[PDB]
Amino acid sequence: SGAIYVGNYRVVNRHLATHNDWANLVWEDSSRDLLVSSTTAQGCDTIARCDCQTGVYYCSSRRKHYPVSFSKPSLIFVEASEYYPARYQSHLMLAVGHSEPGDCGGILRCQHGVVGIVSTGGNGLVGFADVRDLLWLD
Ligand SMILES: COc1cc(Br)ccc1CC(=O)O
Ligand SMILES: [Zn+2]
Predict the structure, then answer these.
(1) Which among 78, 51, 53 is positioned nearest to 68, based on CA atoms?
(2) 54 strand-pairing partners
(3) Do 48 and 14 touch, CB atoms closer than 8 A?
(4) Is 24:41 a contact under the CB 8 Å cutoff?
(5) What is the Å distance from ligand 2's center to 96 Cα?
(6) Residue 14: left if φ>0, alpha if ψ -120 to 50, beta else—which one?
(7) Which residues pair with residue 13 across a beta bridge?
(8) 23: enclosing H helix or E strand
(9) How far is 107 from 24, CA to CA, in rounded Å?
(10) What is the DSSP letter of 20?
């Protein structure tokens, strides 16, 4: 689990969105596994506006922050999962790293702030759903 709080926005994994994220839906993209919902409180996270391909992500299944090289946001295939069918995820950044069910929502961050969150895992790979293109969060 885990979420981004910038301005009046909560960003989550779509597949982990609560009944309240949907009651207050701002934007969802099934293909990217993202949902943004509205908040009452203001958020203190900076969103990274950069083309960084190195940063740190938190891995709840190790209670550890891992530094990673990750791919440019792309249209990369994700297989089964109890949450989705066989489908290409867009704005997806893979890195070599540990990602289990429950590691989704873990924040990847560079010097410029939040690059995105964990959305995919397996095969020794960790998919982060990118949020740097979502300028409207600022
Ligand atoms: C990174 O999370 C996963 C890793 C694997 Br392998 C399968 C499914 C998920 C999604 C989840 O359970 O949130
Ligand atoms: Zn950066």
Answers:
(1) 53
(2) 69
(3) no
(4) no
(5) 18
(6) alpha
(7) 34
(8) helix 19-23
(9) 22
(10) H
